[PDB]
């Protein structure tokens, strides 16, 4: 009845699917355990996909029905939303990949358990159906790959009805007159941005004082701001939330304040989202029965191979401190894989990229100046803009710029910020550079093809190399 | 001063005298200045930019971006998505001024480029007069002699004509006329399959016109492209509705009395005579080195026999302080490779190595999909005789593409067999231009598939697809598919 397996993971988010995978492919008898009705985690199901579906179908709804495509002359007498048809683009979407991955599964032969997985021993996986009944597996290895879940806000209490969390806010059913998002970071100002285009009056409030989240560099994130606010995107910044009330007719009253201060004011909405930060998750996985203790922020502490206390128990992705991003986790689950079977283990938290999908796009990799600054490096910076990059002109798209961080006396590049189009994409050739050490001089002699946009990569690099750009 | 046009005539002295101010004369001449040369960029046109700027990139990538979003709006994609609209028109009038307003802001981006580096603008048609002067003739009969250390020849090209059939940006166009179409021709044939033809041509189908591409050879996109990657492109394009006869030489055409155009034509080697009725004829057999009235032919400087200015591997013709970069000489016909030449020409004028690399000078293909590759292809890698495996991912199982409903193509890599060097990659599909610049970073440092498949690449990215297929190549299996 039991099952032997070699190695047994806990979770099929980007962490643990791909671990699966690569595991089954290194040989290893692989079990997946998954409690949820589909497979791919946070970030297939209410993350990653859902998310960028609707920041696609929005900003195309906001060039239709705004004033893009008339001056491309792309003209349209009424440009209605259906949202529904918007929502279930989303869907199917979701739906391909998810199914994707089961397939993915059989075909490598990694074997999919349905169950809320529990550690049972140091050497066993029970996995509990929802009807009760019970699958064991009897394995060498557990990998915890148990992801994370919405950080509440203490005496707010999230229903997915008027008061959401991101995954009631991806699925809302229409378009609210008035939305409040507490928190202005990544996922905040993605979600604000898309029902703000769909017609929605949207203000952000932020404790801290700008917006995109921990580590973006400050003024990248002053001159996103800036741009949100021109297309409508309200913020409140140094503002705390102490409270909000569900009220009687459906609307929700929510309290700030000055963060610093007392400018005490009430503001109504139909809808508050409530996304200050994500935590991982471990409940109920008995933890605590086999004396692993986790860290004051509920992270499993694990050593360079990803190693719990327990040699033979390891923990990769947002469960384990680190950037909580889907490519991270995936990385990790690899390489904890790949020191089962006895190699090299490395992932440079330096080089993982962030990306931002609004439109302008933001995405970085590497140190901010902030960093730098408190690191006691020396630094000098180039920057370029979209403005003289000759396909963000031909494409008439030219918000924002390339900045590129080199160390003052050895010319590497420490770090790479990119704000306008095709940040997302861009921050990919910046990630190598990080990776193989690159110099700006380097990167400003690479031949890119022209027109493009990375040329403002390779400017923005000749800037710091040089002194000075050809084109700025 | 620093702008020398008619009435101005008096001699100057340079140091570099660069003739063009096309991607390589330009940026030639800007670099030139940061080094400290005294640099004089001679241009015989009203603006500055050369074919790139004018007639060229940029005019066709903003119609292909433009014509691009027509197609979302008047085809399926936006109701896929939701945006509903009763009625999409085109506005070809208004879409051609979106193209000239970009034209327009560059060129007078280059001339802010030239004052704010101290480069003297001469406007005028050069001739070099010795081997240490530039003659300019301008517009009202002046000259103005440059007497100059160094002379960069960076005159471009030109639009190949074909026998028998009269260019006149009416009905028979080349490029130029066929960016500027005044409608959209009901029906037009494109003489020649390569990447400008591709291109022009699936502007205008997008926004509504019936269009066949005749192309001599067997494949579509031109000359050193990927041949797997060269027929699923082909088979793309023809879903699309893009109409192709390979293996067809055309033998006249006859602009009749009713304005339409008959193109006559055979199998190309063979007799299959067919005739093909159009609006618009647009001819794009290819573009040529421009030469003309610049006085090599007293210098004694020969010409290849396809019209190239021969030069060494410091750029340096017969004449050693004569120099010459672009599309004038040997190599890819391409605005970076112009420009890249350019750069390193005149560093070596102030003394540094001159090298450059033309295995990692990229091409792109600027339609939807998009086609871009760098290094070698399968057919060279064969014919020289290298062993390597192949890597490949398709865009159908890339996150990021699935969730935009973008999927066409694939990521292909060539990988050296003993070394995973990273030999050549192939990219079908959406953001294919961008994707090929991670590639030649790459190849740039001799990196391995292993190399790029352990790169942090963001979720979801188009990046990612690349990244499984250096993955496949290197290890055998992607993750993903
Ligand atoms: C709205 C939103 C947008 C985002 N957008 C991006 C983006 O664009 N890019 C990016 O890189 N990241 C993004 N993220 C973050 C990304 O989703 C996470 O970093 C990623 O999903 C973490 O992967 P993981 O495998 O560690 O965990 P998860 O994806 O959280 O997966 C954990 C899985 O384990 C399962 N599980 C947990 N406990 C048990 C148990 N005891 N038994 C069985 N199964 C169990 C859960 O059901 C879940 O399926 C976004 C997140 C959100 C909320
Ligand atoms: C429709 C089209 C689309 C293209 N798209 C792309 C693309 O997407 N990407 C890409 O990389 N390439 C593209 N190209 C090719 C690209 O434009 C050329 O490779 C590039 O412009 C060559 O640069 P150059 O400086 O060598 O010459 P040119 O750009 O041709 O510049 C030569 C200049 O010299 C001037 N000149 C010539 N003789 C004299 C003289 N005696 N005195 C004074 N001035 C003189 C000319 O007026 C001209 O301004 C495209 C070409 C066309 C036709």
Known sequence: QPIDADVTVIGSGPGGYVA???????????????????????????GCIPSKALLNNSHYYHMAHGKDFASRGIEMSE????????????????????????????????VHVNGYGKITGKNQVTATKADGGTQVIDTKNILIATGSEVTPFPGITIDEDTIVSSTGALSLKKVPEKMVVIGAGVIGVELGSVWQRLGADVTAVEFLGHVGGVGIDMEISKNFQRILQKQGFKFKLNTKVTGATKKSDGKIDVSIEAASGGKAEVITCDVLLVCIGRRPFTKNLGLEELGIELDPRGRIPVNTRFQTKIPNIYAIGDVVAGPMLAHKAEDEGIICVEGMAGGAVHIDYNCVP???????????????????????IEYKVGKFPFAANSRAKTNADTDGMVKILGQKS??????????????????????????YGASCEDMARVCHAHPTLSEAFREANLAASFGKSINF
């Not at 995978?21 to 199901?45: D, M, S, Y």
């Not at 990306?355 to 590497?366: F, M, Q, R, S």
Request: hydrophobic share 40%; proline share 2%.
């Open 20 to 46: 699966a995978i690569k595991a089954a492919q290194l040989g290893f008898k692989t079990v997946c355990i998954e409690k949820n009705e589909t497979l791919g985690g946070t970030c297939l199901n209410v």
């Open 79 to 110: 440009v209605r939303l259906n949202l529904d048809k918007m929502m279930e683009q989303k869907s199917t979407a979701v739906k391909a990949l998810t199914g994707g991955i089961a397939h993915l599964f059989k075909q490598n032969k990694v």
């Open 354 to 376: 962030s990306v931002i999908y609004t439109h302008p796009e933001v995405a970085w990799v590497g140190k901010s100046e902030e960093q730098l600054k408190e690191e006691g």
């Open 410 to 435: 050895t010319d590497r590049v420490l770090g790479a910020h990119i704000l306008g189009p095709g940040a997302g994409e861009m921050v990919n050739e910046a990630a190598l550079a990080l990776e």
